[PDB]
Design a protein around this nucleic acid. Sequence first.
RNA 1: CGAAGGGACGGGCGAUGGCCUCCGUUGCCCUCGGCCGAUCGAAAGGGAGUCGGGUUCAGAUCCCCGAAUCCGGAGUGGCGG
RNA 2: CGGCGUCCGGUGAGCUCUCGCUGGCCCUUGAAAAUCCGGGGGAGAGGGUGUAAAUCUCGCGCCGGGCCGUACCCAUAUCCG
RNA 3: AAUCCGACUGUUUAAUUAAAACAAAGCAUCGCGAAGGCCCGCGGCGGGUGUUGACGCGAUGUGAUUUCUGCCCAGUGCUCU
Lengths: 69, 94, 114, 244, 91, 60, 135
Amino acid sequence: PRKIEEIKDFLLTARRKDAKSVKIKKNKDNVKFKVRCSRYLYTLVITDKEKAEKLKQSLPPGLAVKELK
Amino acid sequence: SINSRLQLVMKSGKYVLGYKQTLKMIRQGKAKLVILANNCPALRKSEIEYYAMLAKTGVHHYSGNNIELGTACGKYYRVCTLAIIDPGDSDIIR
Amino acid sequence: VQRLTYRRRLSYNTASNKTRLSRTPGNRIVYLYTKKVGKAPKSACGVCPGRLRGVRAVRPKVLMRLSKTKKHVSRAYGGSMCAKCVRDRIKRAFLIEEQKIVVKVLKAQAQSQK
Amino acid sequence: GRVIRGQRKGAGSVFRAHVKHRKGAARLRAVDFAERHGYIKGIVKDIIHDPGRGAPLAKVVFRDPYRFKKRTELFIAAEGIHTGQFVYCGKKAQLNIGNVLPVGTMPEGTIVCCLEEKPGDRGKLARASGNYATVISHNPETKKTRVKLPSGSKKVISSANRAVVGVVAGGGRIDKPILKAGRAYHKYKAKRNCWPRVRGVAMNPVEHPFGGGNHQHIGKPSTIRRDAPAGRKVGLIAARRTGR
Amino acid sequence: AKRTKKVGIVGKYGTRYGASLRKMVKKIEISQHAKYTCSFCGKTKMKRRAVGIWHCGSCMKTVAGGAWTYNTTSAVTVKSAIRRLKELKDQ
Amino acid sequence: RCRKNTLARRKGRHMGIGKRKGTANARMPEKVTWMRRMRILRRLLRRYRESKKIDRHMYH
Amino acid sequence: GKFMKPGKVVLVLAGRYSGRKAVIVKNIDDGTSDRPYSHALVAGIDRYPRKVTAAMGKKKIAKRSKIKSFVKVYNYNHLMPTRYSVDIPLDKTVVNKDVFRDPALKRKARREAKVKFEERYKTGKNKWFFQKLRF
RNA sequence: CGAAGGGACGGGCGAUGGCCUCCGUUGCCCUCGGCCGAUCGAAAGGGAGUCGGGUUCAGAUCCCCGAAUCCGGAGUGGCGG
RNA sequence: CGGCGUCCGGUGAGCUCUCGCUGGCCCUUGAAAAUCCGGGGGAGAGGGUGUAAAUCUCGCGCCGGGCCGUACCCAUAUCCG
RNA sequence: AAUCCGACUGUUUAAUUAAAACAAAGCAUCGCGAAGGCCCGCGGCGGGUGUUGACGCGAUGUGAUUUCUGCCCAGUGCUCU
Ligand SMILES: [Zn+2]
């Protein structure tokens, strides 16, 4: 898997044609943003609470947003 | 002899020992003459001579070994290429 | 203390059956079959005992997937000639060409004088 | 009686040479225009050790004067050959150690090794570990040359063949004794299965013409004629003398 | 003399093979394992890799030589004698 | 039970002559006593070199 | 004495431009307190012009007579002087010590030296400078 | 004791194929050319690339889940740099 | 289906494996080939001032990977006597 | 503490004999310069030694070290002109 450091590269990766369902993990101040593509599982690590919700509605293509318990 | 003439520089004149230090030494050109050992690699035979003819520096080929050339300078180690800075009271330069 | 077995049908301690010990997330120890340790390329001179620097040392059939810059060094005679001897070949070939000019000048005066 | 040993060595398959780790055949260069009229220059890259042979081999690389390749040769190294030393090959080549040149051209009295017997077979004589050949005299008519071989016999050979100047490197090999069976066991293991030689007297008489009897004795004259059949030509083969 | 009186390098061979055969190879084993000086660099880094081959540690100049000694007494006389005919032919 | 016994081994108990099967070289070899001592002594001389306690000439 | 002059042809020993031919334009031989070793500023070429052979016409000979140049400070012990000499101008307003800190002017310095090296490849003057060293 | 290659780059001639513009196909000619010989021969020699968990009455680096990796192809090059 | 935890350190000529350095021995010098890679060269290519040929493939994307063995014993009861 | 034998490490009659027997380093001979010496093969411009060249190959006898190896060529062999 590939680790993404800064936010906007995940947005361009998540809107790709080959991408699919996004799995969301809440690691108790280590909220992770995992997106499945054809080759790599691109994961974005967010270490702060308030940055998490603004990325919730920033997913255009109606992709699966299933909350992973 | 040559070695008896060479040892007069050792306690009176100024000298530089070693290939790399005499490689840069000729490049300023205040040196006048170099001594080369017979057993040194054939690549570094002509390398000093090409620098020496640029600086009009005389070249003398020692008949003895590099170990014997090191003993001729009074030192306890072998030397490949050496250059004289200024002879004190010797006529090695003509 | 638990003892562990092989994972393949090769039950011999040959050079192609070299393993390493590792820990799984399943709380058990199992063998992992290691690859052979690659060696860096040698110089073309044969007078330098060391191996080339800046080039990855891996099995030769792994060299296909590596990049160009990972297989050589950005220099003339790069990736197959040590830096000590390649610059000595520059000053070897140059002095011959100057000496050949020196010989032919002394050869030319022989033609004119005699 | 059964077939004796030694007689069994002609069939082979147990007594054949161990040529697995050997690095090739030690031969000179082939004849061509550059070798016959002028000289060609070669570079000794490295020196290797041939298993089963007491002499080192010099790896000499020539450039082919016809097509663009470098030709690698297997030269027997003379004593004094170092890596990177230029080695010349031809008629016009000068006279020093490690320089092959025709026998009809150097003055007599030189020391040469790896001598060519017939002109064009790349050297056959005096090349074992330290042996050498000396030239007695030349002959301009009929192009003959008398050369003294290391066995002491003098053979009149042609003047068109060649040899490399010097002695074979690795002399004095037989000066140090073996001191062990194991060092003798390892010596012939690289060559062939011929080391554990059982003497024929202790052997039973069905494997040997000398065996048998209640005492370890020969019982027959050990000097056997030259025209004896196989299985009987055992011992002193056509001996002119026997003592000291 | 420090540790053993006269056996030295053949002190590893013990009571066996006779004294004389041990005495014969005592001159051989010392010359076989001696760190000879170099005629190219001058450093005492000359070793016997294999039979008849002589190799330097510093410049790695590999010289074909004697089986046990660096230069045999036959080759040094041959080299001097073959040099004698060099300028005899040339003059 | 061994942990009770090993604490006596730290104090030298049950380690007389009559509970010693190996030689001195077998238990603590003559090499490791030399192998250790060349770390402590040669480190002590080099640590005193950059602290200017001993110059280069006397240290050598 | 001092034989590194601003018109001296000097071979390059090491670096990416090993084996190329360079002309000294500035010889400091003092050290500038940030480059304390003795050094010089040289101007040299990277891509040697190919053969012309008077048989490929007019368009292709211009293509073959293309020269790619460079500029870099090298060591005195990383260089090889000749007793050849090329008195190519290389005016001092372009090639200077303050050029390596700006990649735009270093492209300008390479471009300015390329045109001046191109003209001397023509007319057959200083011909040895324009074949690659066969090593 | 052997006329032991059927391969390849570039060019010329002619043709068909798909939007004969372009690319592709095959036949002939010019050109280049060796490599030591068919072939077989190691489940311990060399040999690119898969691991974790779970699952069966009996198979699991092989089945499922999840993460990768190697090789080959791509004409119109599928996209960017 | 949930609750938690899966923590902090130090040691030892410790046993095994692996990597690396160095030394010693050889009248013992300790394998070949498939395959891959780098370099020397410049036969050739492309484009004319906005674009191409190139991309020992820089990143991403698509397809496929065909045939055989895989159960169990491997030994005081699955082998040979 | 002695005697004999074999110097020794090693090997030997699987299934009655592990030795003083064999082998062994050392010593002394013989033949051979390649259309050759020894030998295999029904056969061949065949093959092994030989990817070898007298410091080698092949056939012998004795059996570490030290010392010595005396006389006899009438006989039987071998060899020479
Ligand atoms: Zn040396």
